[PDB]
């Protein structure tokens, strides 16, 4: 009686969610059903029927037999263990020829890949009274009025399942190695803004419902972060445009005093009077505070605003977080220069980083390729490249790219763990303290950091941007601080470029 | 951090949901913590620590010691058994003074009544990275933008927790007696449309999250039913208004032949030539099919439309289902006359029934009293009695009520099981076949029914309407056919009437 719910597809037309026919177990336990019948049509042996069904459904025999022993009942079912079973489970039970036993056909929502882009695809939930499906999160929810039907509409994503396997596998390794409390990776076409892969940890499996509800927030669109030093690039770009940044000009490294607080470069001691380019390759906070001073505090807030921060990107995900620019005072101002106080979404970081590879134009990231009905062929929606703004010139963008190149490839680089052999890698590293959730200050511990990397390859003329982030490793927190997210960036990026036939 | 989320309140100002401070246990297990410290700041005896913590949190000691045995880790936590701990769990653990052990403050969403109006109130879910709460269902979801904060705004419901207790207890009894696949009960102020209580089974516990997600649909606003014979009252009202219904006029009871289907009164044989009034007391299908003929099939489809059916009531619940009036052919039309084929929501049923007690005016049912901020005192929204339509005259409404009275109290009544001692009750009984989910036709079985009752008391001048519905009893399915929902209507109605100080006899 329910219309088939529309399918969710990846960019190459692979099925990511679809309606299927599963089956539900029913046991007639009343003798009235088998009155005018030679063979019995009700359970005559509750003990043996309980033992045989335990060989297909995951229920102990005592529990089956207990459910079979209910008085004043015509027929009984078996809860969650008795539904959503396959055509093969059906035939295996049927060959047993247990009296009073049958399988009823029921529609379920099938995610063929299981735990796979879970927080993006989402999950639909079934009302057993009617069989109506309703999306509870993600695409299944956002596009529920379209997917629900007579046949509902299909939604096609820009996700490439091949690149998504790379991301899923790389996140799995990060969990085993670092056991972080939060972890995401996203791959974006550097020239169109399409999201080619996205995943996060922890997450759920839409097929089974395992861990669904444990974390509602999609990291790309709904979680917010103090990004850390990946943010320095936008103050870098601004200082370049305003004449403040000179690659070879020297500046005073070490520390600065901001409202009775001592903020210093990551090594406490600094490096003396060193060039700005070397200051950026080193992720120098003193550089960024010096740059802020020279640009002016009023101008720099507008700089972060033109790069999209503090505002939603107007994507297609529900409840997109706006972030906020931390500018209420000079301490917040100066710490915003290196990515604290200010909070961003990852989708905002992608939009703003895209400026450096598109002559200064930010690309609005997008993951919905099509909404269309396959019966009627009506197209409701078509995603497309769209410029979100042009905060910098082509010249400013190219000079930023020169520094990002240096970050990874300078002979004095501290990010050489992000090099991939055979490929020219570039990007920016981040290490950030994390705000404790229940107010106060920052999370405490030996390495209570949100580590990240905003990378792209091949350098200067990238095909993809790969942004990965890991918050609060609970294992190998020393290594987590040392290597950041290189242990995910490298496999994702290497496998993606090779999959995209980028020359090795 | 996160602004305090607004509270959800009942109509008397009792808290139904609110933010609280709970605690999360943390165990530092690394020796670096106790370097420049006289006393240790890490667990020095993991075995004894595992045995002491086992006396407060619900996890085995071997699992504590195992979790404490994680390598390359500074501190470890303990999953679900290790969070949402009370101030007393806090004081109990701290009195132990176990080295390396602390309790971290975490905000939780607290539902003081546990499983209580669950499918209406909903549940908010926590993002553990930030502590941000977001509603996943019901009021928490619908009003999430107001509740989320400064301080978020409070939402005040029309629910009365005193009356909600009666409904919760009465549904619990129906589950034990009948194990039905679906079951709902709702109490509405008969003169204002206010929802005084609402619940369903199965449902979830918002405090614990138990069974949340197993059924997304709120029965009041989002589930749909073939209502059965409760629907006869609206065809009855039409026939009264169109002059077709005469209480003492005789009609031929028994069966009618409709497009190769034989539909008959519930006893198969009917009762011969009996008065129309008595036909309604008996829940005569032939009466209602005869009624449609005298009004006309075109006129009757418009009749159910003016009663609000097929259309959303446009309440404040998300995704309210509209139902549909089953009229594609004469078989669907005739079966619509006694409440099959056509599908409705309970809230449409309430709205249409209220007409009979408000001189013909339908009242739009409502459950949101107020959205307002307690710091600023800004009121964003205020609920109120609102006429949804006036499909019948005052006389038609009064004539309908006389038949509803008779249904329960006629000396020839088949609904005497809904009588309550000391109170005068009226209403209409319902028994309906249920559409099988996997297409085809109806669910099969000995008594595969959705049984219901749409009642009100005191009769003629009711205080509340009580609508309860039970689909597909899996236990005592024979009794479920015999008694319908009398075993919930009576306790709910009786207890509510007493709480509202209606004089008992």
PDB file of C-alpha atoms in Angstrom, chain A residues 176-344:
ATOM      1  CA  UNK A 176      42.055   1.842  15.758  1.00  0.00           C
ATOM      2  CA  UNK A 177      45.282   3.873  16.093  1.00  0.00           C
ATOM      3  CA  UNK A 178      44.111   7.032  17.901  1.00  0.00           C
ATOM      4  CA  UNK A 179      40.620   6.296  19.344  1.00  0.00           C
ATOM      5  CA  UNK A 180      39.572   9.947  18.892  1.00  0.00           C
ATOM      6  CA  UNK A 181      36.340  11.398  20.230  1.00  0.00           C
ATOM      7  CA  UNK A 182      35.637  13.116  16.886  1.00  0.00           C
ATOM      8  CA  UNK A 183      37.092  12.524  13.427  1.00  0.00           C
ATOM      9  CA  UNK A 184      36.126  13.571   9.890  1.00  0.00           C
ATOM     10  CA  UNK A 185      37.551  13.548   6.395  1.00  0.00           C
ATOM     11  CA  UNK A 186      36.115  15.196   3.264  1.00  0.00           C
ATOM     12  CA  UNK A 187      37.266  15.124  -0.404  1.00  0.00           C
ATOM     13  CA  UNK A 188      36.154  17.953  -2.704  1.00  0.00           C
ATOM     14  CA  UNK A 189      36.678  18.511  -6.443  1.00  0.00           C
ATOM     15  CA  UNK A 190      39.028  21.472  -6.268  1.00  0.00           C
ATOM     16  CA  UNK A 191      37.513  23.103  -9.385  1.00  0.00           C
ATOM     17  CA  UNK A 192      33.745  22.459  -9.116  1.00  0.00           C
ATOM     18  CA  UNK A 193      33.079  22.236  -5.352  1.00  0.00           C
ATOM     19  CA  UNK A 194      31.490  18.784  -5.520  1.00  0.00           C
ATOM     20  CA  UNK A 195      31.854  16.646  -2.408  1.00  0.00           C
ATOM     21  CA  UNK A 196      33.455  13.427  -3.743  1.00  0.00           C
ATOM     22  CA  UNK A 197      33.647  11.742  -0.327  1.00  0.00           C
ATOM     23  CA  UNK A 198      32.713  12.480   3.248  1.00  0.00           C
ATOM     24  CA  UNK A 199      32.720  10.436   6.422  1.00  0.00           C
ATOM     25  CA  UNK A 200      33.106  10.926  10.139  1.00  0.00           C
ATOM     26  CA  UNK A 201      33.714   8.927  13.316  1.00  0.00           C
ATOM     27  CA  UNK A 202      31.939   7.979  15.473  1.00  0.00           C
ATOM     28  CA  UNK A 203      28.972   7.233  13.213  1.00  0.00           C
ATOM     29  CA  UNK A 204      26.272   4.624  12.631  1.00  0.00           C
ATOM     30  CA  UNK A 205      25.291   1.940  10.164  1.00  0.00           C
ATOM     31  CA  UNK A 206      22.048   2.896   8.334  1.00  0.00           C
ATOM     32  CA  UNK A 207      21.319  -0.704   7.326  1.00  0.00           C
ATOM     33  CA  UNK A 208      21.297  -2.127  10.832  1.00  0.00           C
ATOM     34  CA  UNK A 209      20.587   1.064  12.779  1.00  0.00           C
ATOM     35  CA  UNK A 210      23.627   0.375  14.968  1.00  0.00           C
ATOM     36  CA  UNK A 211      24.652   3.465  17.009  1.00  0.00           C
ATOM     37  CA  UNK A 212      22.028   5.588  15.268  1.00  0.00           C
ATOM     38  CA  UNK A 213      21.077   8.518  17.480  1.00  0.00           C
ATOM     39  CA  UNK A 214      24.304   8.453  19.516  1.00  0.00           C
ATOM     40  CA  UNK A 215      25.501  11.593  17.712  1.00  0.00           C
ATOM     41  CA  UNK A 216      23.025  13.651  15.691  1.00  0.00           C
ATOM     42  CA  UNK A 217      25.544  16.165  14.307  1.00  0.00           C
ATOM     43  CA  UNK A 218      26.976  15.826  10.813  1.00  0.00           C
ATOM     44  CA  UNK A 219      30.551  17.105  11.185  1.00  0.00           C
ATOM     45  CA  UNK A 220      30.680  18.734   7.749  1.00  0.00           C
ATOM     46  CA  UNK A 221      27.616  20.943   8.209  1.00  0.00           C
ATOM     47  CA  UNK A 222      26.426  20.903  11.824  1.00  0.00           C
ATOM     48  CA  UNK A 223      29.472  20.599  14.101  1.00  0.00           C
ATOM     49  CA  UNK A 224      31.655  23.645  14.789  1.00  0.00           C
ATOM     50  CA  UNK A 225      35.368  23.784  15.569  1.00  0.00           C
ATOM     51  CA  UNK A 226      38.083  26.100  16.565  1.00  0.00           C
ATOM     52  CA  UNK A 227      39.962  25.074  13.392  1.00  0.00           C
ATOM     53  CA  UNK A 228      43.485  25.805  14.553  1.00  0.00           C
ATOM     54  CA  UNK A 229      46.234  26.822  12.159  1.00  0.00           C
ATOM     55  CA  UNK A 230      44.461  25.888   8.898  1.00  0.00           C
ATOM     56  CA  UNK A 231      42.766  29.248   9.528  1.00  0.00           C
ATOM     57  CA  UNK A 232      46.074  31.146   9.281  1.00  0.00           C
ATOM     58  CA  UNK A 233      45.795  30.958   5.473  1.00  0.00           C
ATOM     59  CA  UNK A 234      42.913  33.437   5.352  1.00  0.00           C
ATOM     60  CA  UNK A 235      44.764  35.994   7.453  1.00  0.00           C
ATOM     61  CA  UNK A 236      47.740  35.128   5.269  1.00  0.00           C
ATOM     62  CA  UNK A 237      45.732  35.938   2.134  1.00  0.00           C
ATOM     63  CA  UNK A 238      44.404  39.185   3.629  1.00  0.00           C
ATOM     64  CA  UNK A 239      47.852  40.433   4.668  1.00  0.00           C
ATOM     65  CA  UNK A 240      49.073  39.628   1.147  1.00  0.00           C
ATOM     66  CA  UNK A 241      46.263  41.654  -0.439  1.00  0.00           C
ATOM     67  CA  UNK A 242      46.737  44.623   1.923  1.00  0.00           C
ATOM     68  CA  UNK A 243      50.511  44.797   1.395  1.00  0.00           C
ATOM     69  CA  UNK A 244      51.355  43.544   4.890  1.00  0.00           C
ATOM     70  CA  UNK A 245      52.914  40.209   3.874  1.00  0.00           C
ATOM     71  CA  UNK A 246      56.375  40.315   2.296  1.00  0.00           C
ATOM     72  CA  UNK A 247      57.847  36.806   1.886  1.00  0.00           C
ATOM     73  CA  UNK A 248      61.435  37.912   2.619  1.00  0.00           C
ATOM     74  CA  UNK A 249      60.728  40.602   5.248  1.00  0.00           C
ATOM     75  CA  UNK A 250      61.871  39.647   8.752  1.00  0.00           C
ATOM     76  CA  UNK A 251      59.737  39.867  11.902  1.00  0.00           C
ATOM     77  CA  UNK A 252      60.161  39.342  15.651  1.00  0.00           C
ATOM     78  CA  UNK A 253      59.301  35.757  16.569  1.00  0.00           C
ATOM     79  CA  UNK A 254      58.690  34.541  20.111  1.00  0.00           C
ATOM     80  CA  UNK A 255      55.580  35.832  21.879  1.00  0.00           C
ATOM     81  CA  UNK A 256      53.232  38.792  22.184  1.00  0.00           C
ATOM     82  CA  UNK A 257      51.367  40.143  25.210  1.00  0.00           C
ATOM     83  CA  UNK A 258      47.608  40.472  24.639  1.00  0.00           C
ATOM     84  CA  UNK A 259      45.433  41.654  27.577  1.00  0.00           C
ATOM     85  CA  UNK A 260      47.707  40.299  30.273  1.00  0.00           C
ATOM     86  CA  UNK A 261      47.982  36.935  28.524  1.00  0.00           C
ATOM     87  CA  UNK A 262      51.169  35.543  26.985  1.00  0.00           C
ATOM     88  CA  UNK A 263      50.590  33.927  23.576  1.00  0.00           C
ATOM     89  CA  UNK A 264      53.668  32.381  21.954  1.00  0.00           C
ATOM     90  CA  UNK A 265      54.787  30.325  18.982  1.00  0.00           C
ATOM     91  CA  UNK A 266      54.280  26.591  19.424  1.00  0.00           C
ATOM     92  CA  UNK A 267      57.894  25.992  20.533  1.00  0.00           C
ATOM     93  CA  UNK A 268      57.767  28.633  23.323  1.00  0.00           C
ATOM     94  CA  UNK A 269      61.173  30.019  22.317  1.00  0.00           C
ATOM     95  CA  UNK A 270      60.446  31.148  18.745  1.00  0.00           C
ATOM     96  CA  UNK A 271      63.259  31.583  16.230  1.00  0.00           C
ATOM     97  CA  UNK A 272      64.489  35.172  16.541  1.00  0.00           C
ATOM     98  CA  UNK A 273      64.145  37.599  13.633  1.00  0.00           C
ATOM     99  CA  UNK A 274      63.003  35.376  10.770  1.00  0.00           C
ATOM    100  CA  UNK A 275      61.306  35.895   7.386  1.00  0.00           C
ATOM    101  CA  UNK A 276      57.529  35.839   7.054  1.00  0.00           C
ATOM    102  CA  UNK A 277      57.565  32.958   4.576  1.00  0.00           C
ATOM    103  CA  UNK A 278      59.550  30.937   7.089  1.00  0.00           C
ATOM    104  CA  UNK A 279      57.090  32.142   9.727  1.00  0.00           C
ATOM    105  CA  UNK A 280      54.206  30.657   7.766  1.00  0.00           C
ATOM    106  CA  UNK A 281      55.983  27.382   7.001  1.00  0.00           C
ATOM    107  CA  UNK A 282      56.496  27.164  10.792  1.00  0.00           C
ATOM    108  CA  UNK A 283      52.805  28.008  11.564  1.00  0.00           C
ATOM    109  CA  UNK A 284      53.962  31.045  13.538  1.00  0.00           C
ATOM    110  CA  UNK A 285      51.308  32.599  15.768  1.00  0.00           C
ATOM    111  CA  UNK A 286      53.506  35.662  16.313  1.00  0.00           C
ATOM    112  CA  UNK A 287      53.551  36.159  12.533  1.00  0.00           C
ATOM    113  CA  UNK A 288      49.740  36.105  12.383  1.00  0.00           C
ATOM    114  CA  UNK A 289      49.443  38.425  15.369  1.00  0.00           C
ATOM    115  CA  UNK A 290      52.020  40.741  13.771  1.00  0.00           C
ATOM    116  CA  UNK A 291      50.098  40.534  10.484  1.00  0.00           C
ATOM    117  CA  UNK A 292      46.854  41.356  12.295  1.00  0.00           C
ATOM    118  CA  UNK A 293      48.508  44.394  13.927  1.00  0.00           C
ATOM    119  CA  UNK A 294      49.684  45.716  10.552  1.00  0.00           C
ATOM    120  CA  UNK A 295      46.369  45.171   8.774  1.00  0.00           C
ATOM    121  CA  UNK A 296      44.237  46.616  11.584  1.00  0.00           C
ATOM    122  CA  UNK A 297      41.656  44.903  13.749  1.00  0.00           C
ATOM    123  CA  UNK A 298      38.662  46.482  11.990  1.00  0.00           C
ATOM    124  CA  UNK A 299      39.766  45.437   8.508  1.00  0.00           C
ATOM    125  CA  UNK A 300      40.611  41.878   9.492  1.00  0.00           C
ATOM    126  CA  UNK A 301      37.139  41.088  10.825  1.00  0.00           C
ATOM    127  CA  UNK A 302      35.725  42.015   7.416  1.00  0.00           C
ATOM    128  CA  UNK A 303      38.407  39.854   5.814  1.00  0.00           C
ATOM    129  CA  UNK A 304      37.153  36.757   7.626  1.00  0.00           C
ATOM    130  CA  UNK A 305      33.576  37.742   6.720  1.00  0.00           C
ATOM    131  CA  UNK A 306      34.282  37.974   2.985  1.00  0.00           C
ATOM    132  CA  UNK A 307      35.862  34.507   3.206  1.00  0.00           C
ATOM    133  CA  UNK A 308      32.433  33.206   4.328  1.00  0.00           C
ATOM    134  CA  UNK A 309      33.008  32.784   8.044  1.00  0.00           C
ATOM    135  CA  UNK A 310      30.422  33.599  10.704  1.00  0.00           C
ATOM    136  CA  UNK A 311      27.720  32.760   8.119  1.00  0.00           C
ATOM    137  CA  UNK A 312      26.125  29.612   6.719  1.00  0.00           C
ATOM    138  CA  UNK A 313      27.226  28.506   3.220  1.00  0.00           C
ATOM    139  CA  UNK A 314      23.541  27.927   2.281  1.00  0.00           C
ATOM    140  CA  UNK A 315      24.096  24.287   1.425  1.00  0.00           C
ATOM    141  CA  UNK A 316      21.452  21.602   1.257  1.00  0.00           C
ATOM    142  CA  UNK A 317      22.028  20.095   4.679  1.00  0.00           C
ATOM    143  CA  UNK A 318      19.509  20.791   7.426  1.00  0.00           C
ATOM    144  CA  UNK A 319      20.477  22.997  10.369  1.00  0.00           C
ATOM    145  CA  UNK A 320      23.761  24.182   8.895  1.00  0.00           C
ATOM    146  CA  UNK A 321      25.768  25.815  11.653  1.00  0.00           C
ATOM    147  CA  UNK A 322      26.881  29.419  11.052  1.00  0.00           C
ATOM    148  CA  UNK A 323      29.959  29.366  13.228  1.00  0.00           C
ATOM    149  CA  UNK A 324      30.975  32.685  14.729  1.00  0.00           C
ATOM    150  CA  UNK A 325      33.955  35.003  14.379  1.00  0.00           C
ATOM    151  CA  UNK A 326      35.521  35.628  17.780  1.00  0.00           C
ATOM    152  CA  UNK A 327      36.133  39.372  17.725  1.00  0.00           C
ATOM    153  CA  UNK A 328      34.645  40.741  20.959  1.00  0.00           C
ATOM    154  CA  UNK A 329      38.081  41.807  22.247  1.00  0.00           C
ATOM    155  CA  UNK A 330      41.777  41.921  21.341  1.00  0.00           C
ATOM    156  CA  UNK A 331      42.519  38.544  22.969  1.00  0.00           C
ATOM    157  CA  UNK A 332      39.748  36.946  20.919  1.00  0.00           C
ATOM    158  CA  UNK A 333      40.945  38.920  17.900  1.00  0.00           C
ATOM    159  CA  UNK A 334      44.568  37.825  18.155  1.00  0.00           C
ATOM    160  CA  UNK A 335      43.681  34.178  18.855  1.00  0.00           C
ATOM    161  CA  UNK A 336      41.267  34.175  15.905  1.00  0.00           C
ATOM    162  CA  UNK A 337      44.341  34.870  13.763  1.00  0.00           C
ATOM    163  CA  UNK A 338      45.557  31.310  14.434  1.00  0.00           C
ATOM    164  CA  UNK A 339      42.175  29.595  14.526  1.00  0.00           C
ATOM    165  CA  UNK A 340      41.013  29.680  18.149  1.00  0.00           C
ATOM    166  CA  UNK A 341      37.976  31.471  19.625  1.00  0.00           C
ATOM    167  CA  UNK A 342      36.474  31.773  16.155  1.00  0.00           C
ATOM    168  CA  UNK A 343      34.467  28.647  15.304  1.00  0.00           C
ATOM    169  CA  UNK A 344      33.874  27.305  11.805  1.00  0.00           C
TER     170      UNK A 344
END
